[PDB]
Structures are given as structure tokens and as C-alpha cells.
Amino acid sequence: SSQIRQNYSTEVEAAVNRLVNLYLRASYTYLSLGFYFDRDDVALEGVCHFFRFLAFFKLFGAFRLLKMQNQRGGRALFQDLQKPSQDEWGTTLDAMKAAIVLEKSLNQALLDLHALGSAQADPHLCDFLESHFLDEEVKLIKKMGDHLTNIQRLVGSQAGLGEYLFERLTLKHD
Amino acid sequence: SSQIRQNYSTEVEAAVNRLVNLYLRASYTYLSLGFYFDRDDVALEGVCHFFRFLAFFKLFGAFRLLKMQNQRGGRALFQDLQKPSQDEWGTTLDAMKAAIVLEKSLNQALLDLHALGSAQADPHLCDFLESHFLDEEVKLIKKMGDHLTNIQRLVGSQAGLGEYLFERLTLKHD
Amino acid sequence: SSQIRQNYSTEVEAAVNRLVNLYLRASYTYLSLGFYFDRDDVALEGVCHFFRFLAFFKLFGAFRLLKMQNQRGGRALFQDLQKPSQDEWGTTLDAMKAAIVLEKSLNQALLDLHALGSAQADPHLCDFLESHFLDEEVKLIKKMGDHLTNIQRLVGSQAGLGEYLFERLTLKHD
Amino acid sequence: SSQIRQNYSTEVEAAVNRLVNLYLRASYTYLSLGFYFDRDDVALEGVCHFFRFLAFFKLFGAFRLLKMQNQRGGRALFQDLQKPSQDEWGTTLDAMKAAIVLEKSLNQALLDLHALGSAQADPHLCDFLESHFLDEEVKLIKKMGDHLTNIQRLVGSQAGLGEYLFERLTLKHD
Amino acid sequence: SSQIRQNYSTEVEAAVNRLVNLYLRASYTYLSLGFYFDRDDVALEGVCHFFRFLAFFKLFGAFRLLKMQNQRGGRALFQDLQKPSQDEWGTTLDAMKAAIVLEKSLNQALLDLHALGSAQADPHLCDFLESHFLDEEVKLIKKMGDHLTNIQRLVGSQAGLGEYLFERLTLKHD
Amino acid sequence: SSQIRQNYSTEVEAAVNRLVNLYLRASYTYLSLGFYFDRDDVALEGVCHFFRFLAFFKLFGAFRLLKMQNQRGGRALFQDLQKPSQDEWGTTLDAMKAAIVLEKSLNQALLDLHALGSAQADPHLCDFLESHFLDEEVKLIKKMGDHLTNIQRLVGSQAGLGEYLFERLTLKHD
Ligand SMILES: [Cl-]
Ligand SMILES: [Cl-]
Ligand SMILES: [Cl-]
Ligand SMILES: [Cl-]
Ligand SMILES: [Cl-]
Ligand SMILES: [Cl-]
């Protein structure tokens, strides 16, 4: 058996591998969102940059989970990565709504893994999630909600104007 | 009796304590305004920051009054602090109108205390208000009036657009 | 309903608002303690400065709770703030005893909210309290206990001398 | 139709999307290789670092292809990403042999796309591959070959010793 | 009774004192390991330095526990410290195996104390262990496991050569 | 036999190991003294810091003896470490008296080992003690005596006042 593994259940080990898959899927979704907004017929640079940053952020989350798996003596196992749910992502509003749905799904997965760790009396797992994931996720969802509200406020009956303004005046661009 | 107190009436001492209560109430109102605009379903960061700054500014006014009370040999007495008049503050326009009403009420209290000090031939009190409160208050009310006019100009028939623009282009934010 | 709220019970939301009230009440108590020790007939600058710092520290705790409430998608609700329990605070010893009673009450409220969050399987709440409140509170209570012991040691039968010495040689002043 | 697209065939557009998939698959393979060598029961840090760097390098190649797709007015389309060919990667020698097989497959795909672009008289495509991919790939394969030879030289009849030495003295580590 | 103690059970207080004893025993074990590898007839400086660093690290853990005991209002109680389990520690491999056994025993003690704190609804205790001990322990055990694997790889049939190489090329020395 | 050992008797080797035990016991005593003075119900920071520094100083003495044992080709042997003589240490005066008794016992052990080395014509041993231990010990005992006199002077009939003053004005603290 493993020479380091201690207090690390097979259930947690498997759920960690599933969570890695979810984060890599999310990263891939954000890559697709970013390149959609980079299209010449969409052309919203600040939106492209927002989602490209999230793609990297989710990849980093996957890396941290994988590092932790090895630190605990579990075995990282990779599965196929499903493609994103859409090929074209509609408006900034559509995209931000899809992103918050995605993040709520990741958050629920975090909460489920935390509950499993608590049930298994695995405090290292619980602390790892609390310290590196739960607050970052709450912060991100709050940000997305703030953005949704500002996007929604700007729709009015001049949708194109509002979409431009949001990208120019809220999102970070050159 | 007090070893330092000189030319400091009981009427002024009491009115100073009442004024502290008014400034702390105002500070609390601004705390509530700030956190309303921080809500994910309101999300106007520059508005949040404007009112949070005013919360601190009013707290500082209360501190100065309390310092002065002690310098004069009066006794600081604290009363319960009433909660703010609203739990939800409507639009930026609604909020800025409530703020200017609040400030006019504080200004009238300043003017009333100055008149009491003048009647009591308390020039230190009168100078203290003139030097640290009256002009700061006039400056703040002017600023708020300038803001009200710009907000009103932006309502038109695209209210959400104007509310965004004001927050982005007039108020200070990240 | 809220677009961000997830795993955030009404019970926790209410208890957070109650806790904000408790921290603001504590802040107000410390404001009163500070200005008492600033009186010309009390005149213990290091004691004034100790309690003024705590007033700010408790205000900051309230701010953090309110920020968290919004991050979670709860609604900040403010209530009236009761005045402090005393108008005059006796000796440094009396004041430090009142402060430790106050802090033990805040600590119990923290522990109660943590237990509620644990019962509700709200790990973000539990981590927030652990990371920003519980240890800070334990550290503060320990400090106060250290101070109480030194004050008590100095009473002897030369109380005024000991009260001066403590203020001069332990507490931070100009 | 597209407002920018010019001299950009559907065949090239599709082959670019396929190539993105191949690079992302390669990146994923290298992520798996890296975490295998990070296991406590493998523990070859320089090998872990070599493959983690390649994972990032292949991701960057995919990003460049996607940027180019948009610059040309094609549509980035993402497909499912197959998991890597192995869950456990054997020795450093096994791993480096798998890596060179992978890279030769990527190189052939590059050469095939270049031939398609040449047949289609698409010089921008051909120059893009020549300038950003072909030489980088030749350089990488040469490096891997150099490594294979040194690993092979070190097998002898003291395989563990040689595997350690290679990791310590050729590969970059802390 | 104690003037600060709150929510701090006698069971936790005792278990903290036992844990201090375990950490000091571990520190003493590492002192002995370090001086064994410093012998002229062993002479593995990097091994000496590894274990001397761990001796200090475990002493620091004991200090932190003792600081916490006082912060909580418990009473630090010291017991006799048993000598280390061996006078001579064999090979680097033998020593590293003894060290990982020691660390797994310390980790189990940490986990047991965390479970007691959880049962006692002592979140400060649980957070203290999570924040300052559990991850540091997992990190250390992983490191030791990595070392064991590299040592084992180097045994082959040239044990002395491999032991030298490990000390020279993995462990930190002058 | 040992390849380096020369002019190093078994008697000296054993006495060196006994002396290490005495220094580690002294270090442990000082750890206990330090944490006693850190208690919230004792709270004499300068006293805590004095004894914590001595704990480290005695540990360093043990390290030097162990280094020397190996340099001479003797074998370091560790025994159980007895717990300190008291769980609670009374007043600063009580504690400083216990410390000087402890140091006189260590000094006598140094003098006894020096006499053994002289009898055995072991000048390296004698020089080692003279150069690194004897004067440091005389200096420390003198310091402790100076402290005892100042503590005793301050008892008078206001013991608590004097104990505070000594800690504040002689001992080093924040
Ligand atoms: Cl498959
Ligand atoms: Cl009342
Ligand atoms: Cl009310
Ligand atoms: Cl599909
Ligand atoms: Cl005993
Ligand atoms: Cl024994």
C-alpha cells in the first residue's frame, strides 16, 4: 500500500479526481467563451479577457487539487473532458448567466466534497477546501452577480450600446 | 465642580451631546446606504464608496465634538442610536435625495447650536463650529447638489443606462 | 430570489445581522470608555488610547460581517443600537473587567454562530469565523486578562500610584 | 458571410480546429505525466517539471492556433478531449519514449496542415506554421532524443541509480 | 477559576499537554538522529542537517501548542521526556523509515485531538490545528515519502554509492 | 575502534553525555519557567522573555557539547529527561532563586568535568570548557545575582508594585 497515505478515504480520493475533471471542464468552457468574444463579429475584448482569466483560474484550481491528491497519497486519474455546452455563447448577458450557472455547479461540488470529508473525519481535506476554494468561489460568484446586475441595467431598449459600454467601462481591456 | 470648565453652559453641553447623537445616526445611515449599493442586485461600486466615505466623515465629526466636549470640561453622554430611516434605498437618485435631506438636517442642527453659543456668549463654541463644521457642511451639500443635478440629467427615458454612467464616470471606483 | 445565494440559510443570515448589531454596540461601548478616560478628571491617556483602538477594531469586525453578508447574498438589516451599559466607568480595573465581560459575550456569540453554521453544513460561514474572528477574539481576551492581572497586582494599598504606573508603563501613549 | 475572411478555406479551418484538439490532448497527456512523476512512490522532481513545462507549452500552442483561427475569420470549434493513453507511465525511459511518439504525431499533423495550406495556396497559414510551430517542434524532438540517449546510456545494470542521476544532473529541479 | 478560559474543556487541555510531550519527544529523537549522522564513522552531513532542521521544527510546534494553551487559559504541564527509541540509527534508509513512522504517529495524535475538539464543539482548537499543524504535517510526510523512494531506488547492489549520492545530490549541505 | 579518537577517556565521554542531559534538563526547566510567566494570571512578559532566552541558551550549550563529543570520537548517548522540579514557580523572586540554584548546579558539574579532564591530562576538554562554558556561566550567575538583589530591594511592603516595576524597568520586553 501507500507509504504516506493516512486518513484518506477511497471515497475522497475518487471525489477529488471527479472534481479535477469538473475544474478542467470549466477551464475549457472559459477558453471557448474567451475565443467567442474574440471573434471579429463579436469583438468584446474586455469580455474575452474576463473569461480567459477565468480559464486560467480554473486550471490553477485543478492543479492545486492534483497536488493535494499526491500529497495525501491518492492516485490522480484523468478522464475524458467533455466539450463545452455551447459552440456560440450569445450576448454578454447570456454568457455571464452561463458562467454563474457553471460556478454554482462547481460550488455545489465543493460543498458536497466538504460534506464527505466532514463525514469521513478528514480535517485536512476540509481545511484545504475552506482555505483555497470556498471563499474564492464565493468571491467569484459575487463578482459575477454584480456584473449580471450591471449588464441587466444596461439592456433597456438600446442593447448594443449597453453591451459596448459595459465592456468598455467595467471590464479590463487595453 | 469641574476644575477646567469656564464659560461653558449646561445648555451647550447638552446640545453638544445631542449633536454627537445626530452625527453618529448620520454615520449609521451612511453605513446602511453603502452596504445597500454593495448588494449583488444593486452593484454600484462608486455609490457604495461615496456613502462609505461619508459614514467615516460623519464618525470623525462625532469624534471632534466629543474631544471638544472634554476639552471644555463637559461630560460626554451617549444615548441609543436610532436605526436608519430605510432598509432599502431605491435608486441612486433616491439615495442622493435622502442624503441631502439628512445633511440639511445636520446643517440646521449646526446653525442652531451656533445660535445658542452666540446667545450664551460662548465664542470658543462658535469658532469651533465655524472652523471645523460649517464650511465642510456647505461644501458637502454643494457636492451633493451637483450630483443630484447630474443624476437628474441622466434619467431621461434610459434610467438604467444613466445610473450606470453616473456611477462609472462621476463617482470614484476601482 | 437572489441570483448568487447558495447554501446560506435564513437562520445564518439573521444571526449575522444580530452579530453586526453586537459588534457595533461593542464599538460604541469602547467609544464611551475611551472618552471617559480622556476626561480632565480621569486623564489616563494610555487607557483612552487602548479603548479607542478597540472601538475601531470592533467597527472593522462589523464591516467584515456586512461585507460577508452581501458576498453570500443575504440582506444586511440594521437595528437600533443600544447605548453602553454605563455613563461613567470607574477605575481602570473596573473598565478592564467590563471590557473582558463584553468580549466574553461577543466570543460566545461567535461560538453560537459557528455552531449554527456547523449544524446547517455552511462551511464558508464556519471558515469565515475561524479565519477572521475566533483567534483574534482569543488573542484579545488573553491580552485583557494579562492587563487585569497587572492592574490587580498594582492595587496594593497605593491604588492611585498603581493606576498611574500601569497607564504609563504598560499602555501605549505619547 | 464573414466580413474579414479571405483566402481561408473550410478545409484549413477544420484542420486548424482538429489541430487545436491534438495540442490540448497533448497538453493533457503532459499534465498526467507530470503528476505521475510527482507521486511519492515515483518522486522524480526534474521529470515532473519537464513534463509540466511541456503541458504549458502545448497549451500555448493551442492558444496561438485559436488566435489565428479568429484572425483569419474562421470559427473555433471545440470537441471532447480524450484522456491520455496511460494512467501510469512506467520509468523515465518509458515516459520519454511516449513523449517522443506524441511529438512525432503532432509534427506529422503540422506537416499535413502545411501541405494542405500549400495545396490551397494559403501562404499566411504556411508562414504561421513555419514561424511559430515547425522549428519549435524540431527543437523539442531533438531535445527529447538527446534525453532518450542519455537515459539509455544510464540503464546499464543499475537502473535505479541511472534514473536518479539523470533526474538530478540533466533535468532542472530545485 | 480562570478569568479568560471559555469553551476550553479539561479533556482538550490535557490532550494539548500530551501533544506537547509528543512533539518534544520527536524533537529529541531528531536531535539524536542528527548527531548520529554527524559521527566520523557515519559522516553524512546532508542527513545530519535534515534531521537537525526537523528537531527545531518540532520544538517550534511544541512552542506553538504551549502558547495556545496559555491563550486559552489552560495550564501547561510538563512530564518527563522519554529518550529516543534507538541509540544508533542504521542507514539513511533505516533513519528515514523511523522518521516517517514517527511522523505518522504525530499526525494521528493531531487527528485525534482534532476529533476531540470537534466532539467538544471547540472551533478555535480545530482551526488552530488545521491552520498551523495538519497541512505542515502532510507536507512533511510527503517529503519523507519522496525521500524514501529515492533512497530505495539507489540501493540496488551498490548501497554505499547510493547513500553517498543521495546525501550529496538531494539533501542540503555545505 | 574509532579512527579519530585520541586522548579521550571513557570517563570523560560518559561525563560529557551526563552533562548534555543536565543542560537539556535546564533548558526544559527554563521552558517551563517561561510559560508560567506567560500565564494570563501571572502575566510578566519580561520574566517570560528572560527565561525563554535561557532555555535557548542552555539548548545551545547542549548542542556544543554534542558537537564536541563527535569531534573527539566519543558516542553521544541520550537518556530520559526528567521534568522540571515544579509545575508552578511562585513569584519572580522564587523563580530567580530557583534559577540561580540551577545554575550553581550546572557550574559545579562544569567544574567537576574540568577537574576530571585535568586529572586525565585532556587539555582539549579543559580548554573547551574554559573557552565556551566557564566564563559564560560566571557571567550568567552574576547577572542573576544582580537581579535577585534588585528584586529583593523592591519587595518592601508593596510586593506587587515592586514585581511589576522590576519586570517593566529591568527586564527586556516589548
Ligand atoms: Cl476512455
Ligand atoms: Cl436607554
Ligand atoms: Cl425601530
Ligand atoms: Cl459531444
Ligand atoms: Cl515525575
Ligand atoms: Cl530508558
Residue numbers in the entry:
A (entry chain A), B (entry chain A), C (entry chain A), D (entry chain A), E (entry chain A), F (entry chain A): 1 to 174
Give the text the authors published on this PDB structure.
As a scaffold for aromatic cluster design, we chose ferritin as a protein cage platform with a 12 nm outer diameter and an 8 nm inner cavity, composed of 24 subunits. To prove this concept through protein engineering, we focused on a two‐fold symmetric inter‐subunit interface of a recombinant horse spleen apo‐L ferritin (Fr) as a target region for mutagenesis. Herein, we present the construction of an aromatic cluster with an artificial molecular binding pocket at the two‐fold symmetric interface of ferritin and explore its ligand‐binding characteristics. We developed a system that uses ligand binding as a driving force to induce and propagate changes in the orientation of multiple aromatic side chains.
Conversely, in Fr‐F5/59L, the introduction of leucine (Leu) imposes steric hindrance, effectively obstructing the pocket's entrance. Replacing Phe59 with Ala or Leu significantly reduced the incorporation amount of NR (1.4 molecules for Fr‐F5/59A and 0.4 molecules for Fr‐F5/59L).
